Amino acid sequence: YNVAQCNMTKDWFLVQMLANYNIGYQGFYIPESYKDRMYSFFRNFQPMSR
Amino acid sequence: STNSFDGSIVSSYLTTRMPPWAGVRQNVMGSSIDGRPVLPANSTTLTYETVSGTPLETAASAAASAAAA
Amino acid sequence: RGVLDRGPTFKPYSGTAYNALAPKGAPNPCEWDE
Amino acid sequence: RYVPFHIQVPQKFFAIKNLLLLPGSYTYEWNFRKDVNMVLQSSLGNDLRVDGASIKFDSICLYATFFPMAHNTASTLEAMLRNDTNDQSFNDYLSAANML
Numbered sequence: 616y617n618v619a620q621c622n623m624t625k626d627w628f629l630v631q632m633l634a635n636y637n638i639g640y641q642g643f644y645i646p647e648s649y650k651d652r653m654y655s656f657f658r659n660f661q662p663m664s665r
Numbered sequence: 666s667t668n669s670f671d672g673s674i675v676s677s678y679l680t681t682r683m684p685p686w687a688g689v690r691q692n693v694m695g696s697s698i699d700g701r702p703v704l705p706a707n708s709t710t711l712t713y714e715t716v717s718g719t720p721l722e723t724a725a726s727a728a729a730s731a732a733a734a
Numbered sequence: 735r736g737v738l739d740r741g742p743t744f745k746p747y748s749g750t751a752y753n754a755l756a757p758k759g760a761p762n763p764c765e766w767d768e
Numbered sequence: 769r770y771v772p773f774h775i776q777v778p779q780k781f782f783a784i785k786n787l788l789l790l791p792g793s794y795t796y797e798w799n800f801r802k803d804v805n806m807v808l809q810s811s812l813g814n815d816l817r818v819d820g821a822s823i824k825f826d827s828i829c830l831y832a833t834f835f836p837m838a839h840n841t842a843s844t845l846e847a848m849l850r851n852d853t854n855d856q857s858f859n860d861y862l863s864a865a866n867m868l
Binding site for chain 4 (some may be wrong): 616617618619620625629631639640643
Binding site (some may be wrong): 735736743744748 | 769771804814820821829
């Protein structure tokens with residue numbers, strides 16, 4: 616049940632993308648450019664591994 | 666040098682709910698089955714994906730059937 | 735869920751990682767047998 | 769060269785992409801590529817076959833993020849969608865045909 620390339624689960628992942636913006640249950644869409652106006656959810660977020 | 670007096674008061678600080686998920690109470694060093702390693706309750710290695718897994722044997726043989734041009 | 739073998743060709747960079755502050759053909763210690 | 773992974777992967781299709789799943793009973797049967805040649809792209813142009821590499825499978829699961837609502841309109845709105853004229857249809861931007 617882990618979200619892509621991190622131990623962060625599906626249980627928490629779907630909270631933030633739906634909490635602020637209208638994408639999540641309606642299938643799976645990519646966020647719009649105007650929405651993430653300077654570090655809103657994804658601009659700071661880039662998951663990594665070593 | 667002295668840090669705390671004999672006869673410390675305990676029942677002052679209020680006790681409540683406890684999340685029963687892995688290692689919430691004591692820094693137990695719980696070992697694992699034949700494959701996985703050991704992790705303590707309060708470690709900074711616990712925050713990552715400390716995972717065990719590699720089969721390889723099929724990869725070296727399947728590529729070798731090209732030998733003849 | 736599982737594993738992926740990438741093989742010996744898997745190179746995520748070019749250049750030198752170890753003893754990288756070296757010119758072209760600076761010799762490590764060794765003995766000639768002449 | 770040895771990395772365990774859990775890569776999350778949705779599907780890309782011309783019709784089954786942005787439709788609605790109604791009540792009832794359904795079966796899922798599909799097929800995946802298991803060769804390093806047709807799946808991966810190199811920055812040099814190297815084929816990963818002839819070079820000691822293969823893909824292994826251990827577990828696959830089909831997930832879904834369902835809409836939570838009051839269970840009255842959950843069956844009412846789809847009962848309107850269960851009509852001969854009121855149905856679903858989808859088109860792609862490259863609905864175009866290819867010829868070589």
